[PDB]
């Protein structure tokens, strides 16, 4: 269950890597790494007492992202909402918040990857 951060960053399936902190309602902010594949976003949380290692804190399907939000006052603090979508709307089942340096680049990349899940044009 413990993983090597560098090994995971270097995996061929990983399209994007964003160092960040995961923000909790408790003022806790955990050094972390977002890894985005063609189908999922992973959050690796650093183990401060074990150099180079992390736990897989979260794994979410990109097709299950239902909202990505931020405030103008704090552009780097991104909220991801995950859950179910249908004709009637969205059902939120999980919420994760991250403080991402250069969050603009991250959110652009993640949105691009989400669109590629939907898109099987010019097959």
What does this structure look like?
The chain is an alpha+beta fold. The chain has one domain. It is built from two helices and eight strands; from the N terminus they run E-H-E-E-E-E-E-E-E-H. It has helices at 5-9, 103-118; strands spanning 2-4, 16-23, 29-36, 40-46, 53-61, 65-71, 74-86, 89-99. The longest helix has 16 residues, at 103-118. The protein starts with a strand and ends in a 5-residue tail after the last helix. This is TBC1 domain family member 23. Directly interacts with GOLGA1 and GOLGA4. Interacts with FAM91A1, C17ORF75 and WDR11; the interaction recruits TBC1D23 to AP-1-derived vesicles. Directly interacts with WASHC1 and WASHC2A/FAM21A. Interacts with FKBP15. Residues 1-123 are annotated as: May mediate the interaction with WASHC1. Residues 1-123 are annotated as: May mediate the interaction with FKBP15 and WASHC2.
The major sheet is characterized as: 8 strands, antiparallel
Percent of residues in helices comes to 10-25%
The number of helices is: 2
Structural class: alpha+beta
- Into how many domains do the coordinates divide? 1
Indicate the radius of gyration in whole angstroms.
15 Å
PDB class: protein transport
Keywords: membrane fusion, bridging factor, endosomal tranport, protein transport
Assembly: monomeric
Entry title: Crystal structure of TBC1D23 C terminal domain
Task: Put the structure in a nutshell.
The protein is of the alpha+beta class and 123 residues long. The protein is built from 2 helices and 8 strands; from the N terminus they run βαβββββββα.
């Amino acid at each position: 269950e413990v993983v090597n951060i560098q090994t995971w960053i270097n995996k061929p399936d990983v399209k994007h890597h964003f160092p960040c902190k995961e923000v909790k309602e408790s003022g806790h902010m955990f050094p972390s790494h977002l890894l985005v594949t063609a189908t999922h976003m992973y959050c690796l949380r650093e183990i401060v007492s074990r150099k180079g290692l992390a736990y897989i804190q979260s794994r979410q399907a990109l097709n299950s992202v239902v909202k990505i939000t931020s405030k103008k006052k704090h552009p780097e603090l991104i909220t991801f909402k995950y859950g179910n979508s249908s004709a009637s709307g969205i059902e939120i089942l999980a919420i994760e918040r991250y403080l991402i340096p250069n969050a603009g680049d991250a959110t652009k990349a993640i949105k691009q990857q989400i669109m590629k899940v939907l898109d099987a044009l010019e097959s």
